[PDB]
Amino acid sequence: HWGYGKHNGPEHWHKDFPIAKGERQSPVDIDTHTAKYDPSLKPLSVSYDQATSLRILNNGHAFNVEFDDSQDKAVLKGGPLDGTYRLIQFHFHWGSLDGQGSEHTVDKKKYAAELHLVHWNTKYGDFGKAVQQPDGLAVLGIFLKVGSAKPGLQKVVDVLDSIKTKGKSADFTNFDPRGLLPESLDYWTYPGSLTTPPLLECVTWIVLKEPISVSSEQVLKFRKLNFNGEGEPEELMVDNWRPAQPLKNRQIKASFK
Ligand SMILES: NC(=O)[C@@H](CCC(=O)O)NC(=O)c1cccc(NCCOCCNC(=O)c2ccc(S(N)(=O)=O)cc2)c1C(=O)O
Ligand SMILES: [Zn+2]
């Protein structure tokens, strides 16, 4: 099945998911000079005060922290969004080295990792129906650079040795995703897709300009995870990022002058 290796990685995905060559694929390079400030964007609102994490899971491609999305608790609204989008999970993409790992790039610059907070449009009732819609999802993307430690990440790092291999999951309650956000909510936005199969074109991307800093030790712990399941040959979970895809007929808007 699909992955990030030579024989099943991004260059192969189109054979099983032809939308991989579609008109609104993600990620993209964000050319900051060609992005245009949009005064029509409303203030972005990230309201995570009532967020309720449930579990953390190694799915063979990344690890997901999943949330209870059965009520309006952790919502994203404003900015480019119409209505309310509810947080369902977050995960990261990262590299084998600090010089790569992000999916989006900024003037071709790659960050060491990228955090994706995944939300679904509440007008569609749940995530499964939302992924049948062109405005079903909103993903808030946050770049990670290696520097000072991010205290709010440490609870995630500390649990990773319990989910080393594909299929392992662990209870993960009371995690506050607000500890993963940078100071500024300045962002770029554009219409795109999931960055992993099935690559569905449902996403309003909101990519924050300001990276968060994590320590080398924190990202090294991400790199100890495994793509493989228990009892299979060990393949370190690294470089689980899709490269930038063609912008085609899209414009990137900036929330800031
Ligand atoms: N062999 C099959 O059956 C194919 C046929 C080919 C096709 O027609 O597609 N069909 C699917 O595979 C499929 C089709 C439609 C819906 C599906 N399930 C729900 C959508 O997938 C949810 C899992 N992913 C995420 O939630 C996610 C991914 C990336 C990001 S990110 N990095 O962008 O933030 C954020 C969230 C699936 C599926 O079973 O997967
Ligand atoms: Zn992602």
Side-chain angles (χ1 to χ4, degrees):
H1 223 272
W2 71 267
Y4 297 93
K6 176 174 73 153
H7 299 288
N8 64 358
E11 298 327 297
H12 292 272
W13 292 350
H14 71 100
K15 292 173 276 171
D16 285 281
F17 304 95
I19 199 64
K21 294 176 182 280
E23 289 310 291
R24 65 178 267 194
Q25 288 289 292
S26 291
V28 298
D29 182 47
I30 300 165
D31 176 329
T32 62
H33 296 292
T34 73
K36 196 185 178 187
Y37 172 60
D38 188 345
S40 177
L41 293 170
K42 288 127 127 163
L44 189 71
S45 174
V46 188
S47 302
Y48 287 171
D49 43 293
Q50 285 315 285
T52 303
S53 63
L54 299 173
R55 200 177 55 141
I56 190 170
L57 169 67
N58 178 336
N59 59 25
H61 313 290
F63 63 87
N64 288 359
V65 172
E66 310 176 65
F67 288 77
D68 168 14
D69 65 350
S70 63
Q71 291 165 264
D72 271 322
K73 269 198 217 183
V75 300
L76 185 67
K77 68 198 317 223
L81 306 172
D82 290 329
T84 294
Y85 285 67
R86 198 173 288 171
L87 176 67
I88 181 170
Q89 55 106 327
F90 74 76
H91 60 274
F92 303 81
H93 306 264
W94 61 92
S96 52
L97 314 149
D98 296 350
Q100 63 193 40
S102 64
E103 301 211 301
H104 293 89
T105 56
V106 180
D107 302 323
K108 299 298 179 84
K109 167 191 174 74
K110 300 173 164 85
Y111 286 87
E114 191 173 325
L115 166 61
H116 287 163
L117 293 129
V118 183
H119 313 73
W120 53 273
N121 193 330
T122 63
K123 77 191 263 163
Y124 302 120
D126 69 0
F127 178 84
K129 178 63 72 183
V131 300
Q132 301 169 206
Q133 321 296 332
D135 62 348
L137 300 179
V139 184
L140 179 59
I142 301 173
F143 294 119
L144 278 63
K145 65 183 271 183
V146 173
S148 323
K150 192 65 167 171
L153 181 63
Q154 195 56 35
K155 301 199 281 170
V156 169
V157 165
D158 285 337
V159 316
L160 295 182
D161 46 29
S162 79
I163 57 154
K164 182 176 180 191
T165 49
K166 177 182 183 184
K168 310 207 38 192
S169 54
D171 179 287
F172 201 65
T173 48
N174 301 113
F175 181 73
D176 185 348
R178 298 180 291 187
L180 299 175
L181 307 179
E183 286 187 356
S184 178
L185 296 180
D186 286 346
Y187 64 84
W188 297 284
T189 183
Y190 74 96
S193 73
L194 302 181
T195 69
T196 55
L199 300 169
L200 299 171
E201 290 178 339
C202 317
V203 180
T204 300
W205 276 96
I206 298 170
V207 177
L208 296 191
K209 177 183 151 176
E210 184 188 334
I212 61 165
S213 282
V214 304
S215 66
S216 182
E217 292 81 355
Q218 289 180 316
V219 73
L220 279 174
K221 290 174 177 195
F222 283 18
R223 299 178 186 132
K224 309 198 163 73
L225 292 163
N226 284 8
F227 285 129
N228 51 279
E230 211 170 3
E232 303 175 339
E234 165 164 40
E235 253 305 89
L236 291 185
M237 174 190 289
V238 296
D239 294 315
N240 59 346
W241 49 276
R242 188 188 194 191
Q245 303 298 309
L247 190 64
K248 286 177 191 197
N249 182 40
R250 295 177 289 179
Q251 288 186 318
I252 300 184
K253 287 331 197 163
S255 75
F256 56 95
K257 264 195 200 63

